[PDB]
């Protein structure tokens, strides 16, 4: 392999990894008493609703979990729990829950590809074939010098009509959702029950259109806005390395960046409940006093410094501003 | 602790800091325990009511050993940032003509009707519009059927609307972005109050007359509104175009005045009474 | 006497009792420059949404 596919020292090898088994088998929550609940997600035929199916069978494990010297997470079988029960080792933590906001998505601005063209073609054909039909069989214009052919009309009609039809037809979409009424959600304790927001909720949110995504697939563009507006939890924890858990890549640590890990929240009404989500950020710090340990973010969390939340909005703007220039 | 803020024509915010051993903090944390998952607050003091919806909550354990919950709420004004003014409310997204929503009238009528037609769309209504849709006499009996609605406009008589003539326009703006400049240039406040059964009077009740009889008898039976219905209104708290004061003195009192836009549209005259 | 409209009210309560009211009379810019920045970012996002249409 090294003689057939030579690679230089320093070559940056790119890969994509599936650390969220959501569409095959994983867990979204469980209990310290009885274990994690194995489940699957599927998108139903509208593209927006996700069904959760719960496995009734006894848990199985990937073959690496028998091998001598292995450590690490596969999303089929997450194992890590950060307990905030008595004798916890975590220095500090913040657990955040954000509710789902929006209940239907509005898209658009421009008509779908070909809709404006098909109308303009019809106006060109109608005006140019009408004076062709009139000049060929029916009539002429009596001018001072004799007869005159009526001009082709299709270009001037198309001109005067353009403000009245351009981006009128197939130019917007509304996509609905079951959020108000009831869904099962990939949150610990919401996987088997059905809960909705309630009769009182925020109604509409605009799907951003600067890269024209709705003209490739309006459902996919609304999937991205559904994801941005989902019910979510996150847990930020500060912890010292290698007891209980080693932090390191698969084969060397119990979990790494992107892996599904569980945790419990100190004052929570049901003390044994494990919330499961993926590690989104890891920070390590060392000083002349030794390690400060790891900052772990579990689930997706906004920058705590509000100035960094200002920079995050400005990055999204400069990307949208670039495509509006194209 | 608790904190709450009111802003003119913008989303105020509120927060509560609470012990995790409080039974209501346990109710906020247990999202299993709520079939209807959203959480709302009211703060009531001296006839004022701050109402809003929970955005998020934090359960925090500090290095020093303190454990607490912070709950954060956004004011009910935030509904207007999640309502879009369609180019034609009465047609499907697939066909939007005319391409701009455009209305000319008194500013309070032109804004409140632009909201009412999008509330009719959101409540899925099939009601035929009167010549004036904000006249209360058209809403009953068994006409508008508002009994199940989350949001409604306060109706009023058109011939009494003194608010300055203006243009409201949108092509799929939010209602906030639509109203922003109109409210600022007209000097108007939008206001919302949630109707609570068994403590508030009916939102549309008024006692106008010589004897002070109710103007419509049985109005709660004729125009039923659910508990928590958010009633929108626009109030003229700057009399700049009729009579008010811009300044004065503690010695001699405030100086009464009127403003008028001159025919170039830019310069305002001030006439002292 | 300078006359203007109340544009913001804020009330705060603690375990020590009430802290009273912050009243803003007339239209004042946010005191924290970060909130001045978040206000200009709201304005840009409203414009970007209309330029996309």
């Amino acid at each position: 392999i090294a003689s057939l596919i030579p690679l230089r020292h320093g070559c940056l090898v790119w890969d994509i990894v599936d650390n969220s088994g959501w569409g095959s088998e994983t867990a979204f929550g469980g209990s310290l008493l009885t274990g994690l609940v194995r489940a699957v997600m599927n998108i139903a035929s509208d593209g927006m609703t996700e069904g959760i199916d719960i496995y009734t069978g006894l848990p199985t494990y990937p073959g690496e979990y028998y091998t001598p010297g292995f450590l690490g997470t596969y999303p089929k079988a997450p194992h890590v729990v950060f307990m905030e029960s008595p004798y916890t080792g975590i220095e500090s933590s913040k657990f955040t829950y954000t509710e789902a906001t929006d209940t239907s998505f509005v898209l658009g601005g421009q008509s779908m590809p070909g809709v404006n063209e098909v109308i303009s073609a019809g106006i060109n054909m109608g005006g140019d074939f009408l004076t062709s039909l009139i000049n060929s069989q029916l009539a002429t214009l009596g001018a001072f010098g004799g007869a005159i052919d009526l001009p082709p009309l299709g270009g001037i009609m198309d001109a005067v009509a353009r403000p009245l039809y351009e981006n009128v037809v197939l130019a917007f979409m509304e996509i609905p959702t079951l959020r108000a009424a009831g869904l099962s959600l990939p949150i610990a304790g919401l996987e088997d029950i059905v809960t909705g927001l309630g009769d009182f909720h925020y109604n509409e949110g605009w799907v951003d259109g600067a890269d024209k995504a709705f003209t490739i697939s309006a459902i996919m563009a609304a999937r991205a806005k559904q994801w941005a507006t989902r019910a979510k939890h996150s847990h930020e924890i500060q912890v010292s390395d290698a007891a209980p858990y080693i932090i390191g890549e698969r084969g060397h640590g119990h979990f790494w960046l992107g892996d599904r890990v569980g945790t419990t929240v100190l004052g929570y009404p049901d003390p044994y409940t494990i919330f499961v989500e993926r590690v989104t950020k890891l920070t390590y710090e060392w000083t002349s006093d030794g390690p400060k340990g790891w900052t772990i973010t579990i689930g997706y969390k906004e920058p705590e410094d509000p100035i960094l939340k200002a920079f995050e909005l400005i990055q999204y703007i400069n990307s949208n501003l670039g495509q509006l220039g194209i | 602790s608790h904190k709450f803020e009111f802003i003119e024509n913008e989303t105020g915010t509120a927060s509560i800091t609470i012990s995790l051993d409080h039974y209501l903090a346990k109710w906020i944390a247990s999202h299993k325990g709520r079939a209807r998952r959203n959480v709302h607050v009211s703060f009531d003091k001296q006839g004022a009511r701050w109402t809003g919806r929970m955005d998020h909550y934090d359960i925090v354990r500090t290095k020093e050993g303190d454990v607490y919950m912070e709950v954060v709420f956004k004011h009910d004004y935030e509904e207007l940032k999640h309502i879009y003014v369609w180019a034609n409310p009465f047609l499907r997204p697939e066909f939007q003509f005319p391409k701009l929503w455009v209305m000319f009238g008194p500013a309070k009528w032109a804004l409140l009707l632009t909201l009412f037609v999008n509330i009719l769309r959101l409540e899925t209504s099939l009601w035929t519009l009167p010549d004036n849709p904000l006249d209360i006499s058209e809403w009953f009996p068994f006409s508008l059927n508002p009994g199940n609605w989350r949001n409604i406009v306060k109706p009023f008589p058109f011939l009494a609307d003194n608010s300055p003539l203006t243009i409201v326009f949108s092509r799929f703006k939010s209602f906030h972005d639509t109203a922003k400049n109109v409210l600022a240039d007209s000097q108007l406040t939008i206001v919302c109050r949630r109707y609570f059964h068994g403590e508030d009077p009916h939102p549309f009740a008024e006692l106008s007359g010589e004897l002070g009889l109710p103007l419509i008898e049985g109005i709660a039976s004729l125009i039923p509104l659910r508990h928590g219905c958010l009633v929108w209104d626009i109030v003229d708290n700057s009399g700049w175009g009729s009579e008010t004061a811009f300044g004065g003195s503690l010695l001699t009192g405030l100086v009464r005045a009127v403003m008028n836009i001159a025919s170039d549209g830019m310069t305002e005259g001030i006439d002292i009474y | 006497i300078f006359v203007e409209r109340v544009t913001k009210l804020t009330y705060e309560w603690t375990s020590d009792g009430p802290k009273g009211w912050t009243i803003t009379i007339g239209y004042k810019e946010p005191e924290d420059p970060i909130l001045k920045a978040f206000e200009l970012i709201q304005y840009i996002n409203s414009n970007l949404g209309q330029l996309g249409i």
Binding site: E302, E304 | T13 | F38
Partner: peptide, 22 residues
């Protein structure tokens, strides 16, 4: 000192919600 900067950071985050939706 750091706790005072942390308190002011939390208050700014609560006030930024006037200007943002996630």
């Amino acid at each position: 000192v750091d706790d005072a900067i942390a308190v002011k950071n939390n208050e700014v985050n609560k006030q930024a919600l006037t200007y943002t939706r996630r």
